[PDB]
Each structure stands twice: as structure tokens, then as C-alpha cells.
Amino acid sequence: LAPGASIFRCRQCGQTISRRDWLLPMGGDHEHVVFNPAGMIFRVWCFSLAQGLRLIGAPSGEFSWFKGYDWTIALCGQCGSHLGWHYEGGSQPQTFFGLIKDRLAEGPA
Numbered sequence: 001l002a003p004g005a006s007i008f009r010c011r012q013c014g015q016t017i018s019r020r021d022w023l024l025p026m027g028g029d030h031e032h033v034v035f036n037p038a039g040m041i042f043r044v045w046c047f048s049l050a051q052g053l054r055l056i057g058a059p060s061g062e063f064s065w066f067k068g069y070d071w072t073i074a075l076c077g078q079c080g081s082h083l084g085w086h087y088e089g090g091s092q093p094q095t096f097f098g099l100i101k102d103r104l105a106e107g108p109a
């Protein structure tokens with residue numbers, strides 16, 4: 001009844017992005033803390049599915065945090081905020097999204 005933690009929206013503009021129902025335990029945990037070559041730390045949640053994003057450029061395997069996957073930058077399709085990455089080219093599953101937990105807002109359906 002009236003769940004308040006069902007949908008993830010973009011924290012900057014409110015664009016619909018994903019659902020708690022779509023969280024994916026990659027390697028046995030939905031949460032992965034990672035850093036990029038510029039040393040920036042991200043708390044990443046894996047989702048099977050997302051919407052309202054704009055995937056920019058072409059996939060790269062360079063420095064992928066997930067063995068066997070190529071990544072594309074995922075922007076909020078509405079406001080352009082960097083929300084994470086789409087992962088493709090791997091196995092079980094072939095694709096998923098890694099989204100930056102603190103750039104999303106959790107709320108009712």
C-alpha cells in the first residue's frame with residue numbers, strides 16, 4: 001500500500017529513470033564502489049533496466065569495472081546530468097545499467 005521507495009528519478013530534474021524492482025545483484029551485490037582514472041569515486045547501483053537516459057558515443061572496453069562488458073556514458077535524457085553507464089557485449093546478462101546512487105532520488109510510483 002502506497003510504497004514511497006518504488007521509482008528512481010533524476011535528482012536534478014525529476015526524469016523517470018528506474019525502479020527498486022529492477023535492481024540487479026551483479027557479483028552477488030547491487031552496490032559496487034569504483035573509481036575512474038581521474039580518481040573520482042562512485043557508489044554504483046546495477047539495474048537490469050532503465051529509461052529516460054541518453055547513451056552518448058560508442059561502447060569502450062577501456063578500464064571497464066565489469067569484466068567482459070563495454071560501457072557507454074548514460075546522461076539524463078532531460079537535463080544532461082551524468083547518471084552513469086550502460087554496459088553491453090557481455091554474458092548473463094548481456095546488458096545492464098550502472099547508475100550513480102547519489103544522482104537519483106527514490107520515491108512513490
Ligand SMILES: O=C1CC[C@@H](Nc2ccccc2)C(=O)N1
Nearest residue numbers: 035036037063064065066071085
Ligand atoms: O566501467 C567504467 C566506466 C567509466 C570509466 N571512466 C573512464 C573515464 C575516463 C577514461 C576512461 C574511463 C571507468 O573507469 N570504468
Ligand SMILES: [Zn+2]
Nearest residue numbers: 010013076079
Ligand atoms: Zn535530469
